[PDB]
RNA sequence: UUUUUUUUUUUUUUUUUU
RNA sequence: UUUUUUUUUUUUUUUUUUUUUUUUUUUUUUUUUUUU
RNA sequence: AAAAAAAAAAAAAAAAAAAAAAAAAAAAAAAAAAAA
């Protein structure tokens, strides 16, 4: 009944007695609510109040559990919290609360007459309180709370620790739970109407606090301070208090980093490699220290006194850099919730999207050349910030004008329009003029253009698009406001396509943009880690607060002038409905009207810049339709990413040129920009770099931007990645395991465990203790997402129950003899989590026959068929290599219960959430739509492909329509039509077909052995030769460059043995990647490759026309010829390991790097592909068992069946 | 081979002044063009509305080098029918595609011609002021040519070599067409009917033309009339065709009145005004608001009161109109009251011309602080000193928009827009594009243009003048032409075209 | 007197980020 | 020497579906249907 | 308009990484495995 008394709770090894016990107890939790309410609210827990122990750095802290009055005894609903204007069109202009104020649950009553304004408002507040709080990623919120609590219990082996008392004092209201969520009517039905309204979110809050406990960010003592701070923030409005003090509880680390004075940090190279360590001072400059006074007074006057005394504790009691790193992680986990932030759109619409004006105004440039409607064609600045930006971009106009010419823009429009998205809603006449099924699948952007493709060359549609409004669309994100972004239809997007294409080109000419270079590992922060190691540096991390609300029309004219100059130097005919011709035109100085040859794109940019409306429109269920104020940036356009990048780099580089022309130097070296976020790096004296920093800040205030200017000697922030002196401080408190933005059921549990693995793999090099994280992931896979229902035919209930209960526990329910199609809920065994096509989760040690255990799988372990190796690891693999056998010992495997998991994973019960997506979609209609859609760009490419496909049909064997470039748009519209008809069934359909195949397969059911799993069976033997370490293991001993890479930690020791990553030391690629899989980014399990290789087995006279049917270029043609030639020779072995790049963040990627640690006998090399394969074996094993080595060289044995398989 | 078929659609070319020669190889060419249009309209409507292979149709029609003959096959039957129809013409070269450079002509072009444009060099005919010029080859061959009769050129046709079947007649003698028809032997010919007048005005920089949507009998002017006489009908219906700054002013007489073609409004202006009217009529919307910008001096209030009266009488609801400088004239009185009156009638009562504005007082102090009191003192200054003074005025325009306070401007427009006694449909003028984030939220905002040289009109005001000119320069320097440009006849036509109830 | 390279198809779902 | 099943691989052929609400089902907009 | 019924349902743009591609049977053949 108690998890903390189990034998798994103290040995952490899956023996045969332990595994059944844990499986039984997790079944007990996942079945019924009564066991959950007895687990979370047992009477054996002694309620504690005072608790003393260590902090994150061993310093003694004393705390006290304190719950305020406003959570237990809420105030009644005050209607003045959400007031209205006197015309009642919207809320009050200056109103405090954008989120859910805490009040008593049953006090929210709608008593008014229906179809009245107050009735609408109280119905929407009801919808706020019930619907907008449930954000559950996997399952019921109580089961996630149970998973976190159970992980804490089985880890710490005791029940007395403060979070159980927080649960019993917040949520224990009677014998039942205060609330439950229901999928049928999607809300949170309360059962105690006297509970506080904010209290459902504290389920997720406690889940995040316990995730921080198992994470190792903060101990049991600091969780008291975190929960006291969080309960204090929910005294009046839980979200507004977190948004108010978000900046002040994080901007303290610079002062403590000053106070430690001197630290010993490593030094990076230019070429992504550690050289050495040095001891630099960490004192901030003199001008930064004038901000600490204002920050100290502000944090004294706004913050909470326990959190303030903790922040002063962290300032005083630090000695090294790592004390500041740990205390920064703790205050991150105390100030961030992790939950997504959501209310009604109308509340956050003011603070989200309303345009505002800051320090200075922006003026207009003089119009040199003017349209007959006096729309500006060519213009130029006299003096101002527009002159400063154009003095830099007028150099870049001329090469971009050459690059734009060589792009066929209609086919570029189609390949951009590939993205499926809503756009416009149809009217009534097209629903009768076009099939109703077409009106059904008309929710896609490519299908909308395929429907209205008959007027693509007609200029009237652009004037027609202005009558339609721009529908708003809300988004959530954790730890930020509810950003309300805009969403526009096809033609609004089409006007912003040519500015996107023109401003796209600047990235190739100038390096200063972080957009082209993203990789997911330490190649992304080579710049910041290199530049923080240098001397006399000044690091400025400038942010613009309110980017889109600051860009007015006149600020948008700066980007307009650059686009117009590039377009006027450009020469393209026939962009859209426009075409190159002569236009009457006005010029300054001339009195009459001239005639110039205007091309197509410059007409398009002129009509885009001239008719610019931004004001969005939301149709509220409260006020009717809400219009937005004009002057924002639209931020749903095509050019919504390049606009900010080009504007900001133009301002900064032009300020550099202006300071040079005024007799002043420029200390700037390199900058990076993605948009709203800018990295700046200066170098020189204090005076010169402070002057240049203040000058760039002044030019941003000249351009009308409210700027957030944090600058330091030894810190940098870009892309939510922070670096302090060659050291990556990750943000583990940013992502959340327990909330999703949208509520989605799990119809396929592979997709749930893939989501779980992808979320856990982001929490490796930003967590401090990955072992508790692995155990927490095991328990939220254990009890949270375990139950899978079933509905059998009522006749064959007991037969299916008598078959499938040999391998599983089927929770048999009551038959209904009155009504048919009864249900039999089952629970699936824990061995399913460890299997390929299953959970793919890392494993705890199992007991063999001998008593010797398997290797405890680390967090760096591979996935794929390398997870299928675990069956052979459960069998005594050294005994299997002893007497030359390959028998899997099905007694032990059925005893652990793996064969039931393989039976369920082969019979595909979980794969059948809808079981079919049928025909009669009228593919004649789809063929007509993609016939009328091909007629836009690059006529003549696809008719040739259809003729080649007909040739391959008529003389030899056919190709799939998937494979043909001409049938690609048919397949695209067809697959878009399949997603518009989606269904997920709550139960199952085991009706005589599934029953016949279950009866056929419920046999002895020995586990099948594919003959190519002989590569899995091999073992390594420990020698007594301690190997040398890499020399950079000595330099990263002082200050760990990640949270989990501390001195002695297993991540640090793997980084010592394997070594850091490098892009040049790639000795084996063509021989490594093929036995990994794909040849040259073309897979072997690619229908391209499969159909081509079936051609290649037959006569090759049909081969050039096969390429014409694909319409691939000549270089890729030669690559594919090499692919078949290299597959036909030694394409036997392949090993298929999946290894995430974020998981392998600082470590080496090339598996050759582990060859110096494993001694291989020379009599094993029998083929041209053994040297790569064996290195794959050794690399996966050294990453797999990194918690068990102590630095010793290995010898490898191989099984003779493996040698016979490799020879063949 | 024109874009719009002249044998089908004759009335549109009759509107341009182009008549058909009655019933030679040009006749055969124009009949073959009509048959090609009929065949294209059959083939394109058989599909969704797209031609199957537009470059193939374009080459077969334009070049005549492609002959599709099949001895799948069903995919090429549409091409083979066109190939036989082009083979049976025996032209030495293919037919060319002809487009006029006018917007009203392009809005009537069918969709299949628009598809054929992208794979064929057309023969685009430029227009002078909306009328296609008559010296071109295709118009001189196909259509019959005009002849201009003036007060000097007027004679019998037998003095010339004029004929009925080759020559059409356009008079601007001022005499009636019946008089010239029955007195001078012009019974057999055919006359061009125009509806607009094109007036060349004398201005300071030179002579200035003007296109007017009214008729010469309606707009009752004669050679030598003043500009202020019939000023309001000119303001409602006139458009200057010359480059700003034009020289039209209160001293302007005229030189000649000539009949001319009417103007056609743009698509975008009618689109934005139709979106505003859709917002007016609907009950889903609570508050409907239009924002109309103009340069300081364009004469926008005397038109927008008439516009509000038209919208009120046509929709039935009461339209409330806020003026251009209501905020300045309100802040001049209530800059010191703690809690002022945000009521609608109190704002509209303080809107007359005797009430001085706040910005005009501050700009008068800014002018006197540099020793400037006259127009001849201001114009004599160079540009850079003016830019310096305009930035000193921007430093006081920025102080009223930066925050939402009880004397601010965003709060003023909030409390006026969302009052209880305020009208539902409101119309608010502005002065610069930065004020749009301050003025109440809309979906529609336009920039208005009139027949005024705004720096010329501010030189002629009886009071002030220098402060008005300086504020005009600051405001023109603050707003560009980045919204839709809307003339007054476009707004009146947009009221007329909307069906009611 | 010979031997080695770094690469863009589509659909859906998830993750990081603007 | 013959036969029972898994898997490496070839050829042919069928080419294809059901309703059950365990659900404590939601709202307004529109085409049509029957009483008042 | 008071009432009853079938259906159409709402989630933009860019940079980067990982995973995925109907079922059942017959005819030819090897290994694993049971019987003789
Ligand atoms: N304290 C509670 N009080 C009342 N009803 C509850 C409570 N907790 C859950 N429920 C409701 O009781 C219903 C019973 O669901 P049922 O037992 O039939 O299947 P279930 O899916 O296993 O339940 P669960 O929602 O816990 O997963 C739940 O769907 C839920 O609507
Ligand atoms: O999904 C998105 C999100 C953001 N964006 C665009 O990138 C910018 C987001 O930039 P940031 O997310 O870094 O900051 P923020 O502006 O949203 O928050 P504050 O600084 O106001 O405190 C925004 O200006 C938006 O235009 C998108 O285009 N799509
Ligand atoms: Mg940012
Ligand atoms: Mg930002």
Automatic annotation (TrEMBL), chain A:
Positions annotated to bind Mg(2+) 1: 543, 676-677
One Pfam match: CPV_RdRP_N
PROSITE patterns named among the record's database cross-references: RDRP_DSRNA_REO (PS50523)
Binding site for UTP: 481, 546, 548
Claim: Nucleotidyltransferase is one of the keywords in the record: yes
Amino-acid positions noted as binding ATP in the UniProt annotation, renumbered to this chain: 33, 143, 180, 191, 787
Boundaries of every RdRp catalytic domain copy: 493-723
Molecular function terms, GO-annotated: RNA binding; RNA-directed RNA polymerase activity
Binding site residues for Mg(2+) 2: 544, 676
InterPro entries: RdRP_C (IPR054002), RdRP_N (IPR054006), RNA-dir_pol_reovirus (IPR007097)
EC number assigned by the record: 2.7.7.48
Sites where the protein binds Mg(2+) 3: 676-677
Coiled coil: none
Keywords from the UniProt entry: ATP-binding, Metal-binding, Nucleotide-binding, Nucleotidyltransferase, RNA-directed RNA polymerase, Transferase, Viral RNA replication
GO biological process entries: viral genome replication
Name of this protein: RNA-directed RNA polymerase
Organism per entry: Bombyx mori cytoplasmic polyhedrosis virus (BmCPV)
Automatic annotation (TrEMBL), chain B:
Protein residues bound to GTP 1: 296-297, 300-301, 461-463
Keywords carried by this UniProt record: GTP-binding, Nucleotide-binding
Record protein name field: Viral structural protein 4
Lineage: Viruses, Riboviria, Orthornavirae, Duplornaviricota, Resentoviricetes
Source organism, top-level taxon: Viruses
Binding sites annotated in the UniProt record for GTP 2: 297, 299-302
Signal sequence coordinates: none
């Amino acid at each position: 009944t108690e998890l903390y008394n189990t034998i798994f709770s103290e040995t952490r090894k899956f023996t045969r007695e332990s595994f059944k016990e844990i499986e039984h107890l997790t079944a007990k939790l996942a079945n019924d609510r009564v066991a959950r309410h007895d687990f979370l609210f047992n009477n054996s827990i002694a309620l504690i109040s005072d608790y003393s122990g260590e902090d994150s750095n061993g310093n003694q802290l004393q705390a006290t559990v304190t719950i305020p009055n406003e959570i237990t005894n809420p105030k009644e609903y005050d209607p003045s919290d959400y007031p209205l204007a006197e015309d009642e069109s919207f809320f009050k202009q200056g109103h405090k609360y954008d989120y859910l104020v805490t009040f008593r649950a049953g006090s929210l009553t709608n008593t008014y007459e229906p179809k009245t304004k107050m009735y609408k408002l109280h119905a929407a507040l009801d919808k706020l309180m019930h619907v907008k709080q449930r954000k559950s990623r996997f399952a019921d919120l109580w089961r996630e709370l149970c998973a976190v609590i159970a992980s804490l219990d089985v880890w710490y082996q005791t029940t007395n620790y403060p979070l159980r008392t927080y649960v019993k004092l917040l949520f224990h209201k009677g014998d039942e739970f205060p609330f439950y969520e229901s999928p049928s009517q999607d809300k949170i039905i309360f059962n105690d109407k006297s509970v506080a309204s904010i209290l459902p979110t504290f389920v997720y809050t406690c889940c995040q606090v316990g995730t921080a406990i198992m994470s190792g960010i903060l101990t049991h003592v600091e969780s008291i301070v975190a929960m006291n701070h969080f309960l204090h923030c929910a005294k009046d409005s839980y979200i507004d208090e977190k948004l108010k003090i978000k900046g002040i509880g994080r901007s303290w680390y610079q002062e403590a980093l000053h106070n430690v004075g001197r630290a010993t940090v490593p030094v990076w190279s230019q070429f992504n490699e550690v050289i050495g360590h040095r001891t630099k001072t960490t004192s901030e400059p003199h001008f930064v220290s004038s901000t600490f006074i204002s920050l100290r007074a502000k944090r004294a006057e706004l913050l909470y006194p326990e959190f303030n005394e903790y922040i002063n504790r962290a300032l005083r009691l630090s000695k090294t850099q790592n004390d500041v790193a740990n205390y920064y992680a703790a205050c991150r986990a105390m100030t961030n919730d992790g939950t997504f932030l959501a209310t009604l759109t109308e509340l956050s619409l003011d603070a989200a999207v309303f345009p505002r004006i800051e320090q200075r105004l922006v003026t207009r440039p003089a119009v040199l050349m003017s349209n007959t409607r006096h729309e500006s064609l060519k213009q130029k600045y006299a003096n101002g910030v527009g002159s400063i930006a154009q003095s830099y971009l007028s150099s870049f106009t001329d090469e971009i004008a050459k690059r734009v010419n060589g792009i066929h823009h209609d086919e570029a429009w189609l390949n951009f329009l590939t993205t499926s998205s809503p756009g416009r809603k149809l009217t009534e006449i097209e629903k009768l003029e076009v099939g109703g099924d077409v009106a059904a699948w008309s929710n896609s952007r490519i299908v909308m253009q395929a429907v209205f493709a008959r007027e693509y060359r007609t200029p009237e549609r652009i004037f027609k698009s202005l009558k339609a409004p721009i529908k708003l669309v809300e988004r959530q994100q954790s730890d930020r406001r509810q950003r309300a972004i805009s969403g526009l239809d096809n033609d609004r997007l089409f006007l912003s396509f040519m500015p996107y294409t023109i401003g796209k080109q600047i990235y190739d000419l100038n390096d200063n943009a972080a957009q082209g270079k993203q990789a997911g590992n330490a190649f992304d922060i080579g710049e910041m880690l290199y530049w923080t190691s240098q001397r006399n540096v000044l690091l400025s991390s400038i942010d613009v607060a309110g980017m889109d609300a600051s860009v007015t029309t006149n600020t948008k004219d700066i980007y307009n002038t650059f686009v117009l100059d590039v377009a006027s130097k450009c020469t393209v005919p026939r962009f859209g409905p426009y075409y190159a011709k002569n236009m009457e035109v006005f010029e300054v100085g001339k009195r009459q009207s001239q005639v110039k040859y205007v091309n197509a794109a410059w007409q398009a940019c002129a009509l885009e810049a001239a008719n610019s409306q931004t004001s969005t429109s939301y149709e509220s269920e409260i006020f009717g339709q809400v219009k937005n104020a004009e002057g924002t940036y639209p931020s749903g356009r095509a050019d919504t990413s390049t606009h900010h990048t080009v504007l900001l780099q133009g301002l900064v580089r032009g300020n550099e040129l202006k300071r040079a022309s005024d007799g002043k130097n420029s200390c700037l070296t390199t900058i990076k920009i993605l948009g709203d976020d800018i990295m700046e790096i200066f170098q020189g004296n204090e005076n010169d770099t402070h002057d240049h920093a203040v000058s760039n800040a002044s030019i941003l205030n000249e351009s009308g931007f409210a700027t957030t200017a944090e600058l330091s000697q030894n810190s940098i922030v870009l892309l939510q990645q922070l670096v302090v002196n060659g050291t990556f401080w990750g943000f583990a408190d940013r992502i959340s395991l327990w909330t999703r933005e949208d509520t989605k059921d799990i119809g396929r549990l592979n997709l749930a465990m893939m989501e779980l693995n992808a979320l856990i793999d982001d929490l490796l090099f930003r967590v401090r203790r990955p072992e508790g994280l692995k155990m927490l992931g095991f328990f939220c896979g254990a009890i949270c997402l375990r139950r899978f229902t079933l509905s059998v035919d009522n006749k064959l209930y007991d037969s299916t129950y008598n078959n499938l209960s040999k391998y599983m526990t089927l929770v048999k329910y009551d038959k209904n003899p009155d009504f048919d199609s009864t249900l039999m809920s089952l629970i699936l065994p824990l061995a399913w989590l460890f299997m390929p096509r299953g959970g793919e989760y890392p494993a705890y040690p199992f007991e063999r026959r001998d008593g010797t255990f398997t290797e405890d799988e680390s967090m760096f372990t591979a996935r794929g068929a390398y997870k299928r190796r675990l069956l052979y690891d459960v069998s005594n693999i050294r005994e299997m290599i002893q007497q030359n056998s390959m028998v899997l010992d099905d007694d032990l495997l059925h005893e652990y219960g793996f064969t039931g998991a393989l039976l369920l994973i082969d019979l595909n019960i979980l794969d059948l959430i809808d079981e079919v997506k049928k025909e009669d979609i009228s593919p004649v209609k789809v063929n007509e739509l993609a016939t009328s859609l091909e007629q836009l760009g690059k006529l003549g490419e696809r008719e040739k492909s259809r003729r080649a496909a007909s040739d391959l049909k008529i003389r030899g064997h056919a190709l799939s329509n998937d494979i043909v470039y001409g049938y690609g748009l048919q397949e695209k519209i067809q697959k878009s039509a399949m997603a518009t008809k989606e269904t997920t069934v709550q139960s199952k359909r085991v009706s005589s077909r599934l029953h016949e195949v279950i009866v056929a397969k419920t046999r002895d059911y020995k586990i099948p052995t594919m003959p190519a799993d002989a590569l899995h069976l091999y073992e390594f033997e420990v020698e007594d030769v301690t190997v040398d370490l890499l020399p950079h293991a000595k330099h990263t001993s002082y200050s760990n460059l990640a949270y989990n890479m501390s001195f002695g930690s297993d991540g640090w020791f793997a980084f010592a043995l394997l070594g850091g990553l490098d892009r040049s030391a790639n000795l084996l690629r063509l021989d490594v990647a093929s036995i990994r899989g794909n040849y040259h980014k073309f897979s072997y399990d690619d229908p391209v490759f499969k159909q081509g290789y079936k051609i290649y087995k037959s006569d090759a006279t049909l081969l050039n026309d096969f390429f014409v049917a694909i319409s691939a270029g000549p270089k890729e043609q030669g690559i594919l010829l090499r692919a078949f030639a290299y597959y036909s020779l030694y394409g036997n072995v392949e090993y298929h390991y999946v290894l995430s790049p974020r998981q392998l963040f600082f470590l080496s990627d090339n598996p050759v790097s582990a060859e110096r640690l494993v001694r291989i006998p020379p009599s094993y090399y029998v083929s041209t592909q053994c040297r790569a394969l064996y290195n794959i074996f050794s690399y996966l094993h050294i990453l797999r068992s990194i918690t068990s080595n102590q630095g010793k060289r290995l010898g490898m044995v191989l099984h003779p069946g493996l040698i016979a398989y490799v020879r063949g | 081979m024109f874009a719009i078929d002249p044998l089908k659609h004759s009335k549109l070319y009759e509107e341009y002044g182009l008549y058909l020669r009655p019933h030679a190889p040009t006749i055969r060419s124009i009949k073959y063009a009509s048959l090609i249009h009929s065949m294209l309209a059959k083939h394109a409507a058989r599909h969704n509305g797209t031609l199957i292979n537009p470059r193939m149709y374009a080459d077969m029609i334009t070049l005549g080098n492609t002959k599709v003959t099949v001895t799948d096959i069903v995919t090429y039957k549409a091409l083979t029918e066109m190939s036989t129809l082009i083979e049976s013409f025996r032209l030495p070269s293919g037919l060319a595609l002809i487009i006029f450079d006018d917007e009203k002509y392009q809005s009537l072009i069918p969709n299949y011609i628009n598809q054929l444009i992208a794979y064929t060099q057309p023969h685009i005919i430029p227009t002078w002021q909306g009328i296609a010029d008559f010296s071109d080859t295709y118009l001189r061959s196909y259509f019959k040519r005009p002849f201009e009769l003036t007060a000097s050129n007027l004679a019998a046709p037998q003095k010339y070599n004029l004929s009925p079947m080759t020559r059409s007649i356009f008079n601007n003698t001022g005499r009636e067409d019946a008089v010239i028809r029955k007195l001078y032997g012009y019974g057999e010919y055919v006359f061009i009917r125009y509806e607009g007048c094109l007036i060349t005005w004398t201005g300071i920089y030179g002579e200035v033309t003007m296109m007017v949507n009214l008729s010469k009998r309606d707009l009752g002017l004669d050679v030598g009339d003043d500009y202020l006489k019939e000023y309001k009908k000119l303001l409602f219906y006139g458009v200057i065709t010359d480059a700003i700054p034009s020289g039209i002013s209160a001293r302007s007489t005229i030189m000649k009145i000539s009949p001319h073609k009417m103007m056609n409004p743009s698509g975008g202006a009618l689109a934005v005004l139709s979106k505003f009217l859709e917002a007016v009529v609907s009950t889903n919307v609570i508050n409907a608001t239009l924002v109309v910008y103009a340069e300081k001096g364009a004469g926008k209030t005397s038109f927008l009161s008439t516009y509000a009266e038209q919208l009120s009488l046509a929709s039935g609801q009461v339209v409330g109109h806020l003026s251009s400088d209501a905020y300045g004239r309100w802040l001049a009185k209530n800059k010191d009251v703690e809690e002022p009156s945000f009521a609608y009638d109190y704002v509209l009562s303080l809107d007359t011309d005797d009430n001085e504005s706040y910005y005009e007082q501050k700009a008068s102090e800014l002018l006197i602080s540099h020793g400037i009191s006259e127009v001849a003192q201001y114009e004599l200054l160079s540009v850079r000193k003016k830019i310096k003074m305009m930035d000193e005025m921007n430093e006081v325009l920025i102080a009223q928009l930066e925050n939402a306070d009880t004397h601010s401007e965003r709060n003023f427009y909030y409390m006026v827009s969302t009052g209880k006694t305020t009208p539902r449909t409101l119309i608010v003028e502005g002065h610069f594009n930065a004020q749009d984030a301050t003025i109440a939220r809309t979906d529609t905002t336009v920039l208005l243009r009139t027949i005024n040289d705004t720096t010329q009109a501010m030189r002629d005001r009886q009071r002030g003048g220098v402060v008005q000119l300086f504020l005009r320069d600051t405001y023109y320097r603050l707003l560009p032409a980045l919204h839709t440009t809307v003339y007054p006849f476009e707004m009146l036509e947009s009221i007329r075209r909307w069906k009611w109830v």
